[PDB]
């Protein structure tokens with residue numbers, strides 16, 4: 084046995100969870116009969132620790148920002164206790180420990196981004212988002228696990244009426260996760276909240292690819308960031324889920340910080356839509372364009388590059404029972420995105436009246452039904468989502484697109 | 490003078506309530522500090538032990554710190570703006586407050602925790618957060634019971650709770666055959682719902698006679714107008730929540746699914762989904778028979794006589810709409826929603842914009858339509874399409 088007791092914190096010095104700069108050690112421990120991680124801080128880091136703890140409180144909490152419990156202080160050290168977690172996201176991905184924990188990659192990214200949006204809403208820029216500082220919780224009483232943002236060491240609270248900070252104020256971040264504007268030769272624009280969106284974009288790809296980075300292996304990574312030399316080749320170019328992820332990630336890691344979406348904007352992206360929501364979008368689009376002119380801006384935009392999206396004739400690329408069922412309505416043009424969406428809407432709307440064989444090939448509503456189409460037309464959602472930005476201001480489409488408040 | 494006990498400090502002059510509750514400080518956070526006497530030490534330990542497991546949820550109060558000196562024990566929780574009693578007696582929407590309270594209750598019940606003492610004094614209203622938002626939180630874990638896994642009932646106890654007025658009849662009367670379950674909290678919550686929406690009335694009357702009226706089943710929900718949509722929906726929920734038969738009271742998750750909580754958009758979507766679902770149904774089949782049972786009263790004999798003239802004019806294009814039919818009223822609503830952009834300006838103007846004003850056009854004129862339709866369409870509650878609207 085070995086236990087150190089400092090006020091309300093106890094820990095086992097043999098149970099080391101990690102090590103930092105300036106002699107910092109993290110141990111497994113207990114506080115108020117709760118499992119905790121206990122960080123021991125040296126005198127030189129007392130002012131540093133007080134600042135970050137102040138910030139991790141003084142700030143409203145959120146489920147996806149790590150819970151801070153207790154500080155204690157003896158003659159030699161300070162101790163900070165936070166909730167004990169199962170893993171870092173780095174450990175989770177590097178070990179491919181999916182069977183053990185069971186947390187879905189999209190949900191963990193949604194949770195991380197919700198935590199990020201919360202920090203940004205408090206005028207807090209994190210500046211050090213990376214898989215090592217995204218923590219994965221222990222299962223709750225219902226077996227549920229969540230991602231939480233940690234490590235507030237580089238965080239900046241921007242003053243009221245300040246929307247940027249100096250790139251020389253402290254350490255720039257962690258090599259390989261630093262936005263190009265932090266280290267570029269020319270300081271064209273001061274860094275903003277979008278430094279975290281860049282880092283988050285790299286994290287998204289890291290999680291979805293199961294361990295690759297958009298800017299390559301560690302040795303060349305930060306140099307590649309400065310060059311803008313990325314590859315997202317783990318994302319299949321003709322797979323719906325990957326096409327959608329690529330469309331988002333490309334914007335998140337854009338070299339121009341002003342082209343990166345805000346955290347709340349990222350949360351609205353189709354990457355995060357349920358299957359039901361994806362189908363509802365297609366239905367809403369089809370209803371919106373049903374009486375639209377073929378030569379108007381909406382249909383022209385929807386049909387621009389449309390032949391690739393429908394694979395020249397979409398009737399070739401659907402199962403035979405559906406082909407048979409669609410011969411009744413000879414007004415569907417195989418070359419048309421509008422008409423594919425019309426066919427989808429028609430079969431969704433009349434689903435109960437369709438023959439058993441047609442219901443069977445489509446699968447049930449909404450999940451299997453929408454996958455029938457997205458599995459066969461991998462660009463259809465991404466293309467349509469882009470094209471229908473023309474209607475993004477309309478009340479019907481406000482659920483699908485992001486509009487910033489001021 | 491400020492008392493310091495470990496991490497907790499307070500000025501003894503700064504009393505929030507009475508055991509004494511002070512305003513104090515813990516880790517540079519404003520807190521409420523309860524001082525516990527020796528007689529209550531085990532009681533305090535039990536409730537704190539239980540609360541560490543549920544605080545966590547945003548609608549269950551956050552527990553911060555305990556201390557113990559030679560004479561007393563101290564418990565610190567977040568400082569709140571008000572109790573729900575204070576809030577009602579003296580900018581959160583009332584429905585949202587009740588949704589939040591119910592979400593906190595559902596969380597407790599999901600952990601097999603029965604509260605047993607829910608009342609407006611025990612629902613705390615937070616201080617505004619950094620974006621000005623306030624929320625309700627369940628507090629006072631003194632009588633909470635954690636049921637063993639797979640166990641649903643517990644014993645009545647003489648003096649649980651000590652203060653009358655909000656207690657389900659099966660908690661008190663030995664005449665009740667069945668022991669109390671989690672549904673005691675739904676009863677209490679039912680009374681709270683009515684208290685909030687009525688702005689201070691109680692279904693079982695003034696404070697003195699409340700508990701005796703509870704035992705008799707003598708309630709009145711007369712603040713809820715019988716021909717106003719919002720009140721018809723609230724009454725239908727509340728009357729189930731305060732039912733004398735505990736097994737007829739809906740679970741907390743069931744309450745959360747009730748139309749009481751639906752946005753106007755969601756009310757409209759339900760109508761649309763219903764109309765789509767019954768479009769190819771036979772008139773003699775059980776779905777449409779159920780929907781048309783009592784239907785003439787719901788449509789006020791002829792719904793075409795109870796809509797505005799521009800809409801009447803617009804609907805005579807489809808001469809096959811039956812004025813006595815609920816199904817056809819719902820068909821008209823769905824048709825006009827679907828074709829809204831193509832309607833003449835005068836018709837768009839009378840209906841109002843989609844979805845909010847549009848659905849209110851109909852629910853204001855046919856106050857029983859949603860309540861009726863929701864009841865009738867229970868026949869489809871198992872179907873995937875109706876998963877938004879019912880709990881199973």
Ligand SMILES: O=S(=O)(CC(F)(F)F)Nc1ccc(Oc2ncccc2-c2ccnc(N[C@H]3CCCNC3)n2)c2ccccc12
Pocket residue numbers: 100101102109120121122135136139149151163164165166167168169170171174218232233234235236
């Ligand atoms: O977020 S902070 O800014 C909070 C403030 F503001 F209050 F200081 N700083 C901290 C950041 C991170 C920490 O924790 C850790 N550091 C390094 C490595 C691991 C961990 C950690 C944390 C939780 N669980 C587990 N579990 C292990 C189990 C076995 C498998 N690997 C995961 N590990 C901190 C710990 C204590 C105090 C502060 C920490």
Ligand SMILES: O=S(=O)(CC(F)(F)F)Nc1ccc(Oc2ncccc2-c2ccnc(N[C@H]3CCCNC3)n2)c2ccccc12
Pocket residue numbers: 505506507510521522523536537540550552564565566567568569570571572575613627628629630631
């Ligand atoms: O929920 S419990 O079971 C937690 C456990 F399990 F940890 F004990 N017990 C407790 C229940 C309730 C308490 O709080 C209060 N009691 C009585 C009166 C007031 C308050 C209170 C609480 C917070 N804010 C404000 N503000 C005033 C401002 C002026 C206008 N009225 C609202 N008041 C508790 C306080 C400390 C400790 C325990 C409390």
